[PDB]
Amino acid sequence: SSTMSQYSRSTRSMYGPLQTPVGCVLGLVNSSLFVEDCKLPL
Amino acid sequence: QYVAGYKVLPPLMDVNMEAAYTSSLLGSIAGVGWTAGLSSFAAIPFAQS
Numbered sequence: 001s002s003t004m005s006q007y008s009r010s011t012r013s014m015y016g017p018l019q020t021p022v023g024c025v026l027g028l029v030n031s032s033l034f035v036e037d038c039k040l041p042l
Numbered sequence: 043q044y045v046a047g048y049k050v051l052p053p054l055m056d057v058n059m060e061a062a063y064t065s066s067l068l069g070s071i072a073g074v075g076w077t078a079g080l081s082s083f084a085a086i087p088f089a090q091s
């Protein structure tokens with residue numbers, strides 16, 4: 001969170017930045033389930 | 043890419059996913075090739091196909 005720019009923070013930070021093959025996500029929580037009908041492609 | 047924000051969306055399947063798609067069609071090339079339609083399966087010996 002240190003060196004930002006543009007507009008303000010869209011942060012509801014309270015638990016861990018998830019490391020993903022698409023990088024890292026703030027807000028998600030780690031889990032291992034199965035979905036064959038995904039509607040939000042991350 | 044970042045010099046003017048040229049973000050590339052990765053294809054929405056990981057490489058293993060369409061790898062398994064290709065695997066399924068490689069298993070089903072004989073498996074469709076005996077009868078019209080997509081009802082049954084035809085996992086015959088491939089040479090016989």
Ligand SMILES: *[C@@H]1O[C@H](CO)[C@@H](O)[C@H](O)[C@H]1NC(C)=O
Pocket residue numbers: 017018019020030031
């Ligand atoms: C979830 O935890 C497992 C256990 O170490 C890890 O292998 C996986 O990368 C984690 N996934 C995320 C999104 O943090």
